């Protein structure tokens, strides 16, 4: 028993170092080399494991149901079931044998050539032949490709048929005005130490047609990943990057001479885009005839996913914020299809995946507006759009009564001198407020005081009923939008600044949708959706159906009063009921304080659909709803 525990110690302590890729550790614990001990010597026990292991990316060693027994007084024999992973999918229910060898008080291996596979013998070979995946589509709502498999034209020099003086420089110089290029990109690309006098150096993916060719220019025809809508969709689609020996280190599955998605849905979707590896994984006998098959399947293409985006949507949405800094969020709000989700300032994904310098990627890391945020799936603070929030949950616990008319005198308000020099904050100087007039006007004022008057415990009693705390099922990474911080605000102030959106809140333009939803359902939140096939999830009863038929007819005058936050949007003559709202952001770098522009709208009429935009940081005199037109039109036409 003491020797049999002993063997058995010594193969587990074998398969963990090749489970562990420590094929040279697993190779000392092998006897010498002889006719009935072992086979090979260490060094080439190391070499057969680093050669046959690597060349099929054998990864994780399993074993079960080991058993070692006695066979002479210095031999004993083990057997065990073991599995394992490779490049061509996982190999399970593997037969191993062989014997122990003991002297001494050291147990060793009798290593043999099946315990690389359970049926090789002598001088077998192993083989691996694989057949590469095509990736899937990802494609909107009626099939328009947002990530498709296209053929690229790829300009590129050949440094020989250039020149040497006057003539090279001039070709170079040719090139570089032809082809939007930098005299010295083209000098530092045939510079480079790879570069041979007759090769081919690629420069730059050309997209649409081709100008006149100078010597040495030349346009080969390549096949990759293409992205028709470009920035307009980069957040959300992603790009896909070259798959390094670090990628096929952590899934051997992947096809180690293909792409792999690096963000956005390209990467989330990554399993179900990139496919299964085809191909065979055989032995051999030393006359090159097939002994064993140990793997064998066809190649499966990657599936295509459709998204309910509206890649018309998706275009005007993000042209519509001219480059700054903001996002914009269209959904049909009776089922919850993401129509758009649009993303300012954006990178080029067609760059990033055709190879893109070090400089073009400094530039997109250290702009100060961040293109790379997917500011869609970002927490904010709503701004004072959330006061259609507070006055749903007012009038639904009774403590708003529609035609009360508060008397405000100025454009600041104190609760007492407790708050010290802090105040709240309002635009228009109006003495008679009501709910319809503060919703008009956009008083934070009058919801501040609705919200104190209302007390913590009732407003969160409202306020729990939406989707904070949630994960919503996207597959978009994102936070659950909070209240605040803690459970308890602790704070008069802090409770009065979430009245109107501002304080610790922190939802995405996603789950604002969500929430904004329910003035499309009569109280009901509708949960949005992305994926077309999905089901419609909902919330009942989230606000009160009253609620819902008091406030909404305000919203429409939010638009058609002379006086209204988002008048401009009376030009469109559509049914409109939006609320526009403000956000003060603190920040460090600039000592004075930035504010976002907000603008909620859809279309009370059909419900047919329900936009979110925000502009983060603003410029002096810009808002969303000077950048929102041309989207109400195109969603009032096409979506009721
Ligand atoms: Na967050
Ligand atoms: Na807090
Ligand atoms: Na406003």
């Given at each position: 028993?003491?020797?049999?525990?002993?063997?058995?110690?010594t193969?587990?302590?074998?398969?963990?170092?090749?489970?562990?890729?420590?094929?040279?550790?697993?190779?000392?614990?092998?006897?010498?080399?002889?006719?009935?001990?072992?086979?090979?010597?260490?060094?080439?026990?190391?070499?057969?494991?680093?050669?046959?292991?690597?060349?099929?990316?054998?990864?994780?060693?399993?074993?079960?149901?080991?058993?070692?027994?006695?066979?002479?007084?210095?031999?004993?024999?083990?057997?065990?079931?073991?599995?394992?992973?490779?490049?061509?999918?996982?190999?399970?229910?593997?037969?191993?044998?062989?014997?122990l060898?003991?002297?001494?008080?050291?147990?060793?291996?009798?290593?043999?050539?099946?315990?690389?596979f359970?049926?090789?013998?002598?001088?077998?070979?192993?083989?691996?032949?694989?057949?590469?995946?095509?990736?899937?589509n990802?494609?909107?709502?009626?099939?328009?490709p947002?990530?498709?498999?296209?053929?690229?034209?790829?300009?590129?020099?050949?440094?020989?048929?250039?020149?040497?003086?006057?003539?090279?420089?001039?070709?170079?110089?040719?090139?570089?005005?032809?082809?939007?290029?930098?005299?010295?990109?083209?000098?530092?690309?045939?510079?480079?130490?790879?570069?041979?006098?007759?090769?081919?150096?690629?420069?730059?993916?050309?997209?649409?047609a081709?100008?006149?060719?100078?010597?040495?220019?030349?346009?080969?025809?390549?096949?990759?990943?293409?992205?028709?809508?470009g920035?307009?969709?980069?957040?959300?689609?992603?790009?896909?990057?070259?798959?390094?020996?670090?990628?096929?280190?952590?899934?051997?599955?992947?096809?180690?001479?293909?792409?792999?998605?690096?963000?956005?849905?390209?990467?989330?979707?990554?399993?179900?885009?990139?496919?299964?590896?085809?191909?065979?994984?055989?032995?051999?006998?030393?006359?090159?005839?097939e002994k064993?098959?140990?793997?064998?399947?066809?190649?499966?293409?990657?599936?295509?996913?459709?998204?309910?985006?509206?890649?018309?949507?998706?275009?005007?949405?993000?042209?519509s914020?001219?480059?700054?800094?903001?996002?914009?969020?269209?959904?049909?709000?009776?089922?919850?299809?993401?129509?758009?989700?649009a993303?300012?300032?954006?990178?080029?994904?067609?760059?990033?995946?055709?190879?893109?310098?070090?400089?073009?990627?400094?530039?997109?890391?250290?702009?100060?507006?961040?293109?790379?945020?997917?500011?869609?799936?970002?927490?904010?603070?709503?701004?004072?759009?959330?006061?259609?929030?507070?006055?749903?949950?007012?009038?639904?616990?009774?403590?708003?009564?529609?035609?009360?008319?508060?008397?405000?005198?100025?454009?600041?308000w104190?609760?007492?001198?407790?708050?010290?020099?802090?105040?709240?904050?309002?635009?228009?100087?109006?003495?008679?407020?009501?709910?319809?007039?503060?919703?008009?006007?956009?008083?934070?004022?009058?919801m501040?005081?609705?919200?104190?008057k209302?007390?913590?415990?009732?407003?969160?009693?409202?306020?729990?009923?939406?989707?904070?705390?949630?994960?919503?099922?996207?597959?978009?990474?994102?936070?659950?939008?909070?209240?605040?911080?803690?459970?308890?605000?602790?704070s008069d102030?802090?409770?009065?600044?979430?009245?109107?959106?501002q304080?610790?809140?922190?939802?995405?333009?996603?789950?604002?949708?969500?929430?904004?939803?329910?003035?499309?359902?009569?109280?009901?939140?509708?949960y949005?959706?992305?994926?077309?096939?999905?089901?419609?999830?909902?919330?009942?009863?989230?606000?009160?159906?009253?609620?819902?038929?008091?406030?909404?007819?305000?919203l429409?005058?939010?638009?058609?009063?002379?006086n209204?936050?988002?008048?401009?949007?009376?030009?469109?003559?559509?049914?409109?009921?939006?609320?526009?709202?403000?956000?003060?952001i603190?920040?460090?770098?600039?000592?004075?304080?930035?504010?976002?522009?907000?603008?909620?709208?859809?279309?009370?009429?059909?419900?047919?659909?329900?936009?979110?935009?925000?502009?983060?940081?603003?410029?002096?005199?810009?808002?969303?709803?000077?950048?929102?037109?041309?989207?109400?039109?195109?969603?009032?036409?096409?979506?009721?």
């Open positions: 028993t003491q020797a049999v525990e002993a063997g058995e110690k193969v587990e302590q074998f398969v963990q170092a090749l489970n562990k890729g420590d094929y040279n550790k697993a190779a000392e614990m092998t006897s010498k080399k002889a006719a009935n001990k072992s086979a090979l010597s260490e060094k080439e026990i190391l070499d057969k494991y680093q050669n046959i292991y690597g060349a099929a990316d054998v990864k994780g060693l399993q074993i079960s149901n080991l058993k070692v027994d006695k066979k002479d007084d210095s031999t004993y024999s083990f057997s065990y079931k073991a599995k394992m992973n490779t490049s061509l999918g996982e190999l399970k229910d593997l037969s191993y044998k062989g014997t060898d003991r002297n001494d008080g050291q147990t060793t291996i009798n290593w043999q050539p099946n315990l690389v359970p049926e090789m013998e002598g001088n077998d070979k192993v083989s691996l032949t694989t057949q590469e995946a095509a990736r899937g990802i494609i909107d709502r009626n099939g328009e947002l990530a498709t498999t296209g053929k690229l034209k790829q300009l590129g020099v050949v440094p020989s048929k250039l020149g040497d003086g006057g003539e090279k420089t001039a070709n170079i110089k040719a090139i570089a005005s032809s082809f939007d290029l930098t005299e010295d990109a083209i000098n530092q690309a045939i510079s480079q130490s790879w570069v041979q006098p007759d090769y081919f150096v690629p420069l730059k993916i050309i997209d649409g081709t100008p006149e060719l100078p010597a040495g220019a030349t346009i080969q025809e390549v096949d990759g990943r293409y992205y028709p809508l920035e307009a969709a980069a957040q959300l689609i992603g790009y896909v990057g070259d798959i390094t020996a670090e990628d096929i280190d952590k899934n051997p599955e992947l096809s180690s001479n293909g792409k792999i998605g690096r963000s956005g849905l390209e990467m989330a979707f990554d399993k179900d885009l990139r496919g299964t590896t085809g191909g065979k994984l055989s032995i051999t006998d030393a006359d090159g005839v064993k098959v140990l793997i064998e399947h066809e190649v499966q293409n990657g599936k295509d996913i459709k998204l309910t985006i509206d890649a018309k949507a998706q275009k005007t949405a993000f042209d914020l001219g480059g700054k800094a903001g996002s914009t969020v269209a959904t049909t709000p009776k089922t919850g299809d993401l129509l758009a989700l993303s300012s300032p954006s990178y080029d994904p067609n760059k990033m995946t055709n190879g893109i310098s070090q400089e073009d990627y400094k530039a997109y890391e250290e702009n100060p507006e961040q293109p790379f945020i997917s500011r869609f799936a970002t927490g904010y603070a709503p701004g004072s759009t959330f006061k259609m929030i507070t006055a749903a949950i007012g009038l639904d616990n009774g403590t708003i009564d529609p035609n009360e008319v508060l008397t405000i005198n100025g454009l600041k104190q609760k007492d001198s407790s708050w010290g020099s802090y105040q709240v904050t309002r635009v228009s100087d109006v003495s008679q407020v009501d709910l319809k007039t503060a919703l008009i006007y956009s008083d934070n004022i009058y501040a005081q609705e919200t104190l209302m007390g913590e415990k009732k407003f969160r009693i409202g306020l729990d009923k939406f989707i904070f705390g949630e994960d919503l099922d996207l597959p978009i990474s994102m936070n659950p939008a909070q209240i605040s911080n803690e459970d308890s605000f602790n102030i802090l409770l009065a600044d979430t009245g109107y959106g304080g610790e809140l922190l939802i995405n333009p996603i789950q604002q949708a969500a929430m904004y939803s329910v003035f499309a359902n009569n109280g009901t939140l509708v949005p959706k992305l994926i077309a096939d999905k089901e419609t999830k909902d919330k009942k009863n989230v606000i009160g159906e009253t609620a819902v038929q008091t406030i909404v007819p305000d429409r005058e939010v638009v058609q009063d002379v209204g936050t988002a008048h401009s949007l009376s030009a469109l003559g559509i049914p409109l009921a939006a609320k526009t709202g403000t956000a003060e603190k920040e460090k770098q600039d000592e004075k304080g930035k504010e976002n522009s907000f603008l909620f709208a859809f279309n009370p009429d059909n419900q047919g659909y329900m936009m979110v935009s925000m502009l983060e940081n603003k410029e002096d005199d810009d808002s969303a709803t000077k950048r929102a037109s041309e989207l109400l039109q195109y969603l009032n036409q096409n979506y009721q």
